[PDB]
């Protein structure tokens, strides 16, 4: 389960998610990628589930990159607790996703296999995704 493993601050402001992902939108490293076409949050649990679904399908051969890291801590108020009396305590970690961000990458597999494994991973994810091949410029 991906986590920053240490941070300067425990808790963060909620913030917003407004960009169009002009960085992280290219297929580096690999040759096929899962690219987010919509906007949202990826929790660590979702990223791991997509990783496992994707890795189990390209069994015995391939290299996979996770280009999404959940570095944003998300707090929750417990049940039967009123408003106020402090923020609340970190529950899980999310990655902010803008349209265009590359989430996963693969190489060493055929394009037909890559599309199959990315469809498996994209069904675990709460975002609209698309399959992209590496491009020259």
């Amino acid at each position: 389960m991906l986590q920053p493993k240490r941070t300067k601050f425990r808790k963060q402001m909620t913030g917003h998610n407004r960009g169009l992902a002009h960085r992280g939108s290219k297929v580096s490293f690999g040759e096929y990628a899962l690219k987010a076409t919509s906007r949202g949050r990826l929790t660590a649990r979702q990223i791991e589930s997509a990783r496992r679904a994707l890795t189990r399908h390209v069994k015995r051969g391939g290299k996979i990159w996770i280009r999404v890291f959940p570095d944003k801590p998300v707090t929750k108020k417990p049940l039967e607790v009123r408003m106020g009396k402090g923020k609340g305590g970190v529950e899980y970690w999310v990655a902010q996703i803008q349209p265009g961000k590359v989430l996963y990458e693969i190489e060493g597999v055929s394009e037909e296999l890559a599309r199959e494994a990315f469809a498996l991973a994209a069904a675990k994810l709460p975002l609209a995704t698309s399959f992209v091949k590496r491009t020259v410029m």
């Binding site: 690219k35 076409t37 051969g61 060493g108 992209v132 410029m137």
Partner: protein
């Protein structure tokens, strides 16, 4: 094979360029370099997109046709839509036969299914870096550069110094001192 038709464009700015991509599908573009001043042009989106399916579209000199004024240019940079992926803008560098240019030439890994590591050791080719950048004269601009794996074993790493410049091209990062790892055979992912 590479022909591109353009029209001189005089309406500039955010609103003008958004109207180009929205109403009458066209691509803003600029031509600079050489000995002339920059020239703002427009291109058909379907025309530039079709040209870019060619793997050599970036390492080959194009013949821009700016309203009847043919001119040899290189596709220097492209701006793509981050989500949809279509081309939003294109930078054309005027190619001059006397002045050296710098371009990113795609790599062609050959002898992949004959490598020592792949068969005798059962490794994976694992393309690390494609798209070497080269500084050469326009006549020496190659369409691609072979990596000719062939004799690569389970621990070998293909560096930038192990390639062969075709005629007179110079690998720019090699000149700086960065021996980039082009590829490496490693053990199969278990």
């Amino acid at each position: 094979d590479f022909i591109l038709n353009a029209q001189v464009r005089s309406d500039l700015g955010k609103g003008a360029s958004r109207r180009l991509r929205r109403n009458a599908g066209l691509v803003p573009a600029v031509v600079y370099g050489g000995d002339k001043e920059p020239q703002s042009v427009t291109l058909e989106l379907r025309e530039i997109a079709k040209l870019l399916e060619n793997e050599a579209a970036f390492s080959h000199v194009i013949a821009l046709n700016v309203g009847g004024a043919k001119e040899t240019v290189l596709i220097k940079a492209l701006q793509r839509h981050p989500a949809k992926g279509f081309v939003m803008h294109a930078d054309f560098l005027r190619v001059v036969a006397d002045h050296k240019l710098t371009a990113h030439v795609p790599l062609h890994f050959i002898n992949e299914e004959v490598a020592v590591g792949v068969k005798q050791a059962g490794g994976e080719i694992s393309h690390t870096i494609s798209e070497v950048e080269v500084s050469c004269l326009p006549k020496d601009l190659p369409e691609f550069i072979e990596v000719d794996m062939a004799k690569v074993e389970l621990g070998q790493i293909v560096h930038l110094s192990d390639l062969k410049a075709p005629k007179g091209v110079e690998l720019v990062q090699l000149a700086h001192g960065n021996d980039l790892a082009v590829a490496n055979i490693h053990a199969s992912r278990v």
